[PDB]
Amino acid sequence: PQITLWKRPLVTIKIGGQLKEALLDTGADDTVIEEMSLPGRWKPKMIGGIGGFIKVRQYDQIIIEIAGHKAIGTVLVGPTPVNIIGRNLLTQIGATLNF
Amino acid sequence: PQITLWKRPLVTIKIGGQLKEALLDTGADDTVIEEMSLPGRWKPKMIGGIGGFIKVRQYDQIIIEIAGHKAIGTVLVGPTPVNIIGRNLLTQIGATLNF
Ligand SMILES: COc1ccc2c(c1)OCC/C=C/CCCCN(C[C@@H](O)[C@H](Cc1ccccc1)NC(=O)O[C@H]1CO[C@H]3OCC[C@H]31)S2(=O)=O
Ligand code: NA
């Protein structure tokens, strides 16, 4: 689709067998999802955004469906106020910014 | 242009005759710039991101050029780690997300 930016660019995702709503976020390097369990190994990580840092769990090789499009990549899990699809997965659905 | 997301979508902006670098950020509702001098009146605003809230100063009706596109709108000034062009100005430059 072409998504205009009058409102937040929210889409449905499927992750870890769960449906969630998430923001398509070109300003996020990383994909960050609210607390949930994911299978497999993880390691801690700190990520910093506009209000400081949060601790997250880094899970690699996680399959996700974003607005119908399947991809695989790293997912960070932790106390983000909003679920965000960052560039690491936006590239895999072929998302571009156009103006 | 058409901007892929394999690197941060960093562009040049011009505010007050000075050039700065900023991130085109679909996950930001508003535009947030590092401390600088702007004309006119302001009002403090709290915005919530990853990490928590920060206080910013809201300046309305600011002339700002983004990647050569002229805009006139609200700029929040405060301790952001990166200059961010949010949806309030991405809509002024006719930006869309496409996949
Ligand atoms: C109202 O106007 C605004 C203005 C800005 C924001 C906002 C409302 O958020 C609203 C609430 C949503 C929060 C949910 C997620 C955060 C949303 N944000 C924009 C986002 O693009 C920031 C922009 C950014 C970029 C660099 C440093 C700091 C911030 N990126 C970010 O936090 O990314 C993290 C995940 O990947 C990693 O890569 C970059 C840092 C890290 S934001 O800055 O908090
Ligand atoms: Na894994």
Ligand code: NA
């Ligand atoms: Na003003």
